[PDB]
Design a protein around this nucleic acid. Structure first.
Ligand SMILES: [Zn+2]
Lengths: 51, 316, 119
RNA sequence: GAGCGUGCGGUUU
RNA sequence: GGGCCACGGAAACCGCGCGCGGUGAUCAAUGAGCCGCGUUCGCUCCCGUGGCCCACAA
């Protein structure tokens, strides 16, 4: 439910930054498992976004 | 605005003192292994785990043996959880006292006008009492209100229970209230910034470094322990004093180069080298004006020594 | 977003929702990211469908790289709300994988053709 | 042993 | 004698919760309910054991 403007850094329940107008995203980090079953594959997707 | 945000004057005691580049390792000069031994992770805790589990995980994944977190976050709560690695572990004792900021989602049990809500929330700025102790609310800001939902930011003394605070707001309004969502946005010097890293980034950065050979992103994942002490008053010492204080020698006046103004007796102070390395943590035995005018005497009782004893020569 | 390893025609996305719509009350599909993934892992997934507005990305982003390893066709659809509704459930689904095709066996063979083209 | 930090709460030696 | 650093001042089992594997649902598929396996950090003062120093910064 709690969201955040990726540009202003504003906190909000809305999907549009009422400060800047950008689309907002969920304030919480993704849930993580100490087993990380798909770490192998996330990393592949991640390396591409980076080089 | 929290107390740690105050700007500090820097008084200069020895204008001529410079530092020898061949002694010590300034933060951005530490080989990555050494960067970890004295590292502090600015962690964004996920919903679900306890702060302690999160720390056990990190210890397992990065193959460490020591690591303690700062102010404990509850399982359901997310956000800023400072995590101190290895030989940096104890710096956490300097985080524990500093103020916190949260963004909270309070859900009312009755219907209240937006004006009453805000008007009433802003009574709580000041002192409060929670079951039997007395904590402080530095500020309350109501972001937005959707009927029964109230999103607000709050700034507190450490040791303040938001859950409990929300309850008291429920009661002041009469209809009652409960916390449906909490996120910590700042703990002492740790804020939500480009250093604030999730577990996925952290373990991935680790494997890019360990398995790919790219130490870069992992180095950004870790901050120097000097970070953990940015909100503290500082006294900077000459090289000739550094090995002595790392040996449990207390810091006398003649070792000072530069200090913060405003230091009062008993205050907790970081002791830094001129390369801005954290040497020790200690307690003032003089105010700032005393340390300056004086020329002999104990200025700081050294209590916790972080810097290793071989980084600087024993110039005594 | 970033997990979206390619664009998709408008008429093509509507195609995908047609198959799952069919292959459920007829064939055998598996909805929900956790089921869809088990499917790929086991290699019984014929075509994986991925919603585009999944937040956070880490939820579905392991899928496109997984399908590569398993050489299984995967397509994107606009909405996790409509992808859900189109799977016999009134919730939302970030990820579906038709294990076994229905009336849409041809329509499915048609899509692998157009994804292979989009890489 | 006294404690703290919000995270823990119950049986026993 | 004093300071600093290191180690030592218990162990086990259950419960919520959480996490994994399985199943996959009559607005939780970003995973219900059930079954199984797992799962919790450090700090501060004080006292013992040991190590390094006794250094007003030259
Ligand atoms: Zn923003």
């Amino acid at each position: 439910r709690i969201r955040k403007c990726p540009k202003c850094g504003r906190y909000t329940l809305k999907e549009v930054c009422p400060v800047c107008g950008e689309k907002t995203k969920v304030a919480h980090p993704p849930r993580f498992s100490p087993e990380d079953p798909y770490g192998e594959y996330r990393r592949r997707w991640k390396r591409e976004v980076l080089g | 605005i929290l107390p740690a945000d105050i700007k500090r004057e820097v008084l200069i005691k020895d204008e001529n003192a410079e530092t020898n580049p061949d002694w010590g390792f300034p933060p951005e000069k530490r080989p990555i292994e050494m960067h970890i031994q004295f590292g502090v992770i600015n962690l964004d805790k996920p919903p679900g785990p306890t702060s302690h589990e999160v720390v056990a995980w990190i210890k397992k994944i990065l193959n460490l043996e020591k690591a303690g977190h700062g102010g404990t976050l509850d399982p359901k709560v997310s956000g800023v959880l400072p995590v101190a690695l290895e030989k940096a572990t104890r710096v956490v004792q300097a985080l524990l006292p500093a103020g916190k900021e949260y963004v909270a989602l309070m859900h009312l049990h009755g219907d209240v006008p937006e004006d009453k809500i805000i008007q009433v929330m802003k009574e709580f700025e000041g002192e409060i009492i929670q079951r039997l102790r007395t904590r402080k609310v530095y500020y309350i800001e109501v972001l937005e209100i959707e009927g029964r939902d109230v999103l607000f930011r709050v700034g507190v003394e450490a040791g303040t229970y938001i859950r409990s605070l929300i309850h008291h707001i429920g009661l002041a309004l009469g209809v009652g209230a409960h916390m449906s969502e909490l996120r910590r946005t700042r703990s002492g010097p740790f804020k939500e910034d480009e250093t604030l890293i999730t577990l996925h980034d952290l373990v991935d950065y680790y494997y890019f470094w360990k398995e790919d050979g790219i130490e870069e992103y992992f180095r950004k994942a870790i901050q120097p322990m000097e970070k953990a002490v940015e909100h503290l008053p500082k006294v900077w010492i000459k090289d000739s004093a550094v090995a002595a204080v790392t040996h449990g020698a207390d810091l006398a006046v003649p070792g000072i180069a530069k200090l913060h103004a405003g230091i009062k007796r008993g205050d907790l102070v970081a002791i830094m080298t001129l390369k801005d390395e954290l040497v020790a943590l200690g307690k003032a035995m003089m105010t700032s004006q005393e340390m300056l005018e004086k020329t002999k005497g104990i200025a700081v009782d050294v209590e916790k020594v972080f810097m290793p004893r071989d980084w600087y020569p024993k110039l005594w | 977003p970033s997990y979206v390893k390619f664009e998709v025609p408008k008429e093509l996305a509507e195609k995908a929702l047609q198959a799952v719509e069919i292959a459920r009350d007829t064939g055998k599909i598996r909805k929900g990211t956790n089921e869809t993934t088990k499917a790929v892992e086991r290699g019984q997934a014929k075509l994986v469908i991925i919603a585009e507005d999944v937040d956070p990305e880490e939820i579905v982003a392991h899928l496109p790289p997984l399908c590569e390893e398993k050489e299984i066709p995967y397509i994107y659809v606009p909405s996790k709300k409509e992808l859900g509704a189109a799977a016999g459930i009134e919730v939302a689904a970030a990820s579906v994988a038709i294990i076994e095709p229905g009336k849409a066996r041809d329509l499915v063979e048609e899509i692998a053709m157009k994804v292979k083209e989009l890489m």
